[PDB]
Amino acid sequence: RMGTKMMGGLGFHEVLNNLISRISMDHPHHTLFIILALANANRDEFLTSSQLDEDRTEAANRIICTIRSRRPQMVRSVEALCDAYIILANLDATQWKTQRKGINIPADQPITKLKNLEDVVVPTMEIKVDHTGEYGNLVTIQSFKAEFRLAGGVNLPKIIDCVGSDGKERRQLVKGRDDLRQDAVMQQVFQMCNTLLQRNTETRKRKLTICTYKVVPLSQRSGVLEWCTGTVPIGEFLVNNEDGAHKRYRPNDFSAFQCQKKMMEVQKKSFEEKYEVFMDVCQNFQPVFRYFCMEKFLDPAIWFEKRLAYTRSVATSSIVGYILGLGDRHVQNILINEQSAELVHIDLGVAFEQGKILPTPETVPFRLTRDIVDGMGITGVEGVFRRCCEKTMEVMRNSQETLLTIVEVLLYDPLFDWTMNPLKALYLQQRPSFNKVAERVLMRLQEKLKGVEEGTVLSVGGQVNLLIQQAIDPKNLSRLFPGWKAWV
Amino acid sequence: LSTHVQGFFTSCLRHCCLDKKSQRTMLAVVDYMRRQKRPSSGTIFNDAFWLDLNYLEVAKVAQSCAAHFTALLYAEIYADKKSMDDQEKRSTTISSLSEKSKEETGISLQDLLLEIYRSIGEPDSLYGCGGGKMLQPITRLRTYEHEAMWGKALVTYDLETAIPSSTRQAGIIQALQNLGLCHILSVYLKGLDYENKDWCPELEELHYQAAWRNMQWDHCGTSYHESLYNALQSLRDREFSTFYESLKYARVKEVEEMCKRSLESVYSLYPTLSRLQAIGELESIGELFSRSVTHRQLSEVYIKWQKHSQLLKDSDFSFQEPIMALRTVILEILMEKEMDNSQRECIKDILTKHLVELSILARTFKNTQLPERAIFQIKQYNSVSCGVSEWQLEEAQVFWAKKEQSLALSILKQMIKKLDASCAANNPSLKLTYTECLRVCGNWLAETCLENPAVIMQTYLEKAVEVAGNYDGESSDELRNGKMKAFLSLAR
Amino acid sequence: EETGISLQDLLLEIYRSIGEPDSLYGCGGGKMLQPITRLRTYEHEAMWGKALVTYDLETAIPSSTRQAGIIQALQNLGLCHILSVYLKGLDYENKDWCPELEELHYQAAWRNMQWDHCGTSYHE
Amino acid sequence: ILARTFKNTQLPERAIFQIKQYNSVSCGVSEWQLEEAQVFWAKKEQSLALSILKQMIKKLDASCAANNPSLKLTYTECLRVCGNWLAETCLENPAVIMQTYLEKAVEVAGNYDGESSDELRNGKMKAFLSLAR
Amino acid sequence: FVLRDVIYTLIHYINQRPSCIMDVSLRSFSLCCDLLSQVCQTAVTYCKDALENHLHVIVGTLIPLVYEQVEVQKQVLDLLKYLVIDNKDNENLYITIKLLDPFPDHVVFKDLRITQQKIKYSRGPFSLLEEINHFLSVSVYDALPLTRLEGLKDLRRQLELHKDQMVDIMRASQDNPQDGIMVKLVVNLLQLSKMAINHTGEKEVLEAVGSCLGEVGPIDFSTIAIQHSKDASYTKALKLFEDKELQWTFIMLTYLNNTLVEDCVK
Ligand SMILES: Nc1ncnc2c1ncn2[C@@H]1O[C@H](COP(=O)(O)OP(=O)(O)NP(=O)(O)O)[C@@H](O)[C@H]1O
Ligand SMILES: [Mg+2]
């Protein structure tokens, strides 16, 4: 909201600038990267629009100068670190697409040169807030490793290792040609939902939380985020062609490739043919996710604890994502922690039921496919999952006012590009007035928080039952995009 | 090896093997073999079948040997193997698998799963395996007790007669106690003793529990509640040696009874920990009762009790209620016993605070009869004065929780009128009560739509803010909290 | 303070005598907190659990009406076995027998088909 | 039924217990089992009522073969009430509710051709109204 | 091996003895005590780290011995003073002196208690978490419940007057409740109580455990399955061997070595 047009004795912009300056000076480690990203919105083309953008850039530059006046060393060194990060992101690295061993970082990159930045806390870490202004004994960046790994994708992000003051490595994912501000905002909402869950006894006793990771956008088209070490994509564990769980445990069933091909063939056909093909595929494709906890945790007590944690994580994530209208929950967008068996949701670009606007609309509130339920045990959705879903929905309903206020603050953020556009819709599904929309989304969220679904008021249990029935309905799953992999 | 091991495991359930040590040895053999990789390339599920085992019988034996997690894992393995075998043969939910297992090996999978989940003690998992014996009265009563549906449990216990008399009477007594009904419970126990001469130990324990909870001091191996009653009676009689002896015996008995269990689930420890904490609190109060009693010692004892209650904020109500009841009995004994120094007012205030805390705790756990009983106990020792007290506000809150809005509003309005007539910005203690009463009355009137917004804002909310702030009784923490709450209500 | 008669109490008694159910809510402001009025409200609304709890709790109520209300609340909730054991304990605890308790005992005896329990009243 | 109408739940349970004292469970179900399911529904115990009604429906389907005129009304009412309860609780998708319960109740009431009755006419009217709704 | 065998043989001789002591029994007892003292002195003099593994059992055996006749009491106190007081400056023995169980509150134990408490508190004052950690670390040494009795009392004091720090402890254990220190302490106390069953002075140990468990009531531990303390050294030793036969050999050798300190001669 920073600007320059209405500065004055009682102007909004001057008061906002003073408040933001005070916040930045009291807590530089929580605000410097944000303000620099605002100031470095168009740094990408520099290294290699509207009046609002220029006003925001000028105000951010003013805040940077004011911060630098009292503490110049940290500002200069953080600027150098951000420049090195953006330069590393802009690296093409198209030749090493086939290599998975670790590519040595070129000596030209400035990230290799910089060592011992005592004034820079690691951006990936979560910095605890102390009310006393002094910050001390914080883990600062010491150096970076000389090797970077390549992650699969259309545009290849880079996995780097940062060695901090304590000498312990932390893996970071550097991305370019993509916007990370949406992910950071969604992480903020996830943190607020976790705080709401913590302060209620019913959900605190069950330890219901949403797994979160730190995202730091460095420009309008680049960023660095926390790499969730010890996690594997659920699709990688399940339907990997070489040593996937489906291939290992059910050799005589359909291969994942066969199911995918059969699903694509029926795409341009009638709905009845889609449903019958989906049923035939599900007949020859049985879930095997229950073997995830069995093969990793041989001790029965640890196995039971990990399975319970997995089920609780699935329930909490499903309810929270339904409240926020999270979409694009395909197998590569969900990771599972190998140590704790808890689910982490990534790629949060699609939310607030924008996925229903897609060419092939998403007909499910969340992902509750056969493998997800099979991972819950012999009882399935009954028992822990349904009760935890009811508890999470009860907490959500009890905090509808605060949640609605937070989403109101989100939706009117000028820099939050949450609405669906044709280019984004086409990129999501490829094959070989704003105020009106915001008000509609807010009213839909209000209806969800009050338990109104189809014009009828439902209890927490009834709403949970309706959501589970919609999520597990084969008719809805048969209509989904093949990339969603509803049969997995 | 497969046929002989299967024969051994079926011998355990024939009911022949009846020695727990041999069953544990063979279960250890199975557990070790489960973790080894077979020479042929395969998965962990294949590694689970070094021998052609029937894992349902092994799971039943493990449950008999109190290996609940192992039994659950073996039941899951058996279900998976049965499904795979059925699919291979053809080239079914839990109920169908249970029917087939019952007609093949004689063990119902659903019943075994329900027993395993009951043994584990995880509350939500009890809803997963429900389809079996839903209509059976025992399962219904267990569900009612788990959900604290004490009225439904009492009705079902009274109705069903095929249940054995001992457990039926135990459930009736528990349901009566959990709903208050102390006089009804005492008369029921008297009638039961009239109708039967034979006395079973569990009914004796329940009778002793009712005797000490209701302060019936003429009711007089030793059990826990008998030991508690004897210790309380000795404390009243100032018999301290036998008091300490009985407390020590009860402590040793509790620990010994805990030692003979499986020690596999954390939920098995909580009742023992609650009993031991109650015994420790009684023992601590014993020393204070022995020597002279002063304001400072009572204050420190109550502060320690409040700290331990804060440590127990996440515990279940079933583990906190006995401690609160024992604290109430201890305080009432302390007040009732010889006090000629006129400093029984300190115990009166301490007991009032304790009963307000108990009412708040019972309200938090959706219980309404216990707060009413606590309010009655408060009114027994207290009266209505010009300077109102916090227990009247607590009573109004209790009546609100009972879905009796008119009564709570009337009580709060009378409280506000009395405070306005009495207080003139002179009593710092009355300030917080006045502000909270005004704020709560305004919030309730807003919620019920019984008053227009203008009157609610003029008379209650801004008035609460003005009382909290313009009185200028600053330099306090509770005042800061009350000011924050009033500001938030007015802002909302 | 002038004539010694409370208008609100008189109105409440008149409306109770008339027996019109809704009119009982018109004059409520008097003696809302009194246990007798609360118990009458609970009985009028068939809140038998609340009536039973309040009857058990409050002791200043005379024993005869307290026991009558307890028995009525127990009967209206079923609880035939509990009611019978309560009556047995009550007879154990007291030798003097008032006529209303005798009528209630006879009512419980015929309702529960206790045929060994044996001016005459209706239930007798 | 009368105690349920007056918002009383303990008396219907006692009456159901008294019924079960003298009666048992047979292949040809009776109306008191449906009444017990209704009582459990009035107790806000929806899972128990649904389980009882589904067991009733399964037993009726296994036993009856459009042969008993008395069982026809019970079967139709059980199917209609189960469909309505499943619709109210949102525990089943509309397609299964319509295929298995509502149209099935209409078919049982009408295609069996056990006409010339008043209770049959009332049951047919209720099933038609439920399907229409 | 000879050192360990001699100490364990003498300890077994001392532990089992007639309640009534005659002249020949007293002479045999004095001979055992003298031989134990001579062996301890020689081993300490010529090998500083010789007693780092056998000090705990020797002290636990000698402690009940002072509640006896004066003649044997003189020898037992002389041996205890030589082991503890006379070798406080010894660097290889100072580590193991810190970890032994506290001595009972008695006038005869005044000097030994003072020395041991200073050796324990030389670094500084102890917090509640530090006290619990020390109590848990002492456990792994000797499987004799009665020897721990005094330590139990000490714990019951701290949990009585450091309840404020228990809130901070539970808060610190919230994120990872599987290895919460309080549930670990409860499980260790219950294991100790199980060990005390069917042993001399079991009621006192049970009462101490009951008091300790009454100090920490039914606190929600946020965990379902009880985990037992497992030896990390054993696990690391197992990681070394890849062959199944080598792991079997290691397990059998560990069992055989652990059985060598048993009273039975066969
Ligand atoms: N925060 C993270 N922690 C761990 N692994 C991650 C994380 N984010 C992404 N990955 C991995 O990197 C892969 C690439 O995913 P992503 O970063 O979303 O790029 P993408 O697949 O192209 N989706 P997008 O870039 O938004 O079009 C994922 O499939 C994961 O295996
Ligand atoms: Mg992706």
Residue numbers in the entry:
A (entry chain A): 2526 to 2573, 2591 to 2974, 3001 to 3056
B (entry chain A): 1862 to 1876, 1899 to 1974, 1984 to 2112, 2121 to 2392
C (entry chain B): 1995 to 2112, 2121 to 2126
D (entry chain B): 2260 to 2392
E (entry chain A): 1463 to 1728
The authors write:
Ataxia-telangiectasia mutated (ATM) is a large protein kinase with a central role in the cellular response to DNA double-strand breaks (DSBs) and related genotoxic stress. ATM, which belongs to the phosphatidylinositol 3-kinase-like protein kinase (PIKK) family, is essential for the sensing of DSBs during the cell cycle. MRN contributes to the localization of ATM to DSBs, and together with double-stranded DNA (dsDNA), it activates ATM as a protein kinase.
Cryo-EM samples were prepared by mixing ATM with the non-hydrolyzable ATP analog adenylyl-imidodiphosphate (AMP-PNP) and MgCl2. The cryo-EM data yielded a consensus reconstruction in point group C2 that extended to an overall resolution of 2.5 Å as determined from gold standard Fourier shell correlation (FSC = 0.143). The refined model contains over 90% of the ATM residues, with the remaining residues in poorly-ordered or disordered loops. The ATM FAT domain plays a central role in dimerization, which buries ~3800 Å2 of surface area on each ATM protomer (Krissinel and Henrick, 2007)., the kα9b helix occludes part of the putative substrate-binding site, and the packing of the coiled coil against it may well stabilize this autoinhibitory conformation. The adenine ring is sandwiched between hydrophobic or aromatic residues from the N lobe (Leu2715, Leu2767, and Trp2769) and C lobe (Leu2877 and Ile2889), whereas the N6 and N1 groups hydrogen bond to backbone carbonyl and amide groups of Glu2768 and Cys2770, respectively. The Mg2+ ion, which contacts the AMP-PNP α phosphate group, is coordinated by Asn2875 and Asp2889 of the C lobe – interactions conserved among both PIKKs and canonical protein kinases. In this superposition, the ATM N lobe is positioned remarkably similar to those of inactive mTOR and inactive DNA-PKcs, with the three N lobes forming a tightly clustered set clearly distinct from the cluster of active mTOR and active DNA-PKcs N lobes. The positions of the N lobe hairpin and other ATP-interacting residues relative to the C lobe catalytic and magnesium-coordinating residues are much closer to those of the inactive mTOR and DNA-PKcs structures compared the active ones. This positioning thus suggests that in addition to relieving the blockage of the substrate-binding site, the activation of ATM may well involve a conformational change within the FAT domain and the associated change in the relative orientation of the N and C lobes of the kinase domain. Our cryo-EM structure of human ATM shows an overall symmetric dimer, albeit with the Pincer and Spiral domains exhibiting some mobility arising from conformational flexibility within the Pincer domain.
